[PDB]
């Protein structure tokens, strides 16, 4: 098991919020692009980044990848449900439970980024990131779509100085 497995696992688990959000936006007829990258949130991200002593611009870049990867899952769900509406989940999403999960996963990701900051700047980061994703792909049984989302969501983990 790799040193970055805990950050990648938290990122993969966070990707899973795409299924519940997709379910609500489909029935609510809401745009997937209106997804919260707005000034107040960007400020709030950067402040919690300074509070953990990590570079906000790095952290901002990570969540920018995270949002692109999550929008991608939601778009893929929408295609599937256009092709075949009956494969949509029959159960409504638990958004209130998702809120608490996102708060916790957000916090775990930031605390891991500080805890492992030294490694993310080292030349061996890329090799460690591969091992982490390869482990997380196996342990969470990620399908092809989530594997790609994980790659997009972590593609700038090692862009750290």
């Amino acid at each position: 098991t790799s040193q970055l497995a805990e950050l990648v696992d938290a990122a993969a688990e966070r990707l899973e919020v795409a299924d519940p959000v997709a379910a609500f936006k489909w029935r609510a007829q809401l745009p997937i692009e209106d997804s919260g990258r707005v000034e107040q949130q960007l400020a709030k991200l950067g402040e919690d980044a300074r509070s953990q002593h990590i570079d906000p611009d790095y952290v901002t870049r990570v969540f920018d990848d995270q949002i692109r990867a999550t929008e991608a899952i939601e778009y893929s769900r929408f295609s599937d449900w256009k092709l075949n509406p009956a494969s949509a989940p029959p159960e409504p999403p638990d958004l209130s439970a998702s809120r608490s999960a996102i708060d916790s996963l957000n916090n775990r990701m930031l605390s891991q980024i500080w805890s492992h900051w030294s490694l993310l700047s080292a030349p061996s980061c890329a090799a460690q990131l591969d091992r982490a994703k390869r482990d997380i792909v196996r342990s969470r049984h990620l399908d092809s779509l989530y594997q790609r989302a994980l790659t997009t969501a972590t593609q700038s983990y090692c862009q750290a100085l």
């Binding site: 609500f24 809401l30 997804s35 919260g36 707005v38 949130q41 958004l95 809120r99 708060d103 957000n106």
Partner: peptide
Amino acid sequence: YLWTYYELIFKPC
């Protein structure tokens, strides 16, 4: 709207 960029934020329409 329903946001996910940093916080899961939900406003009923």
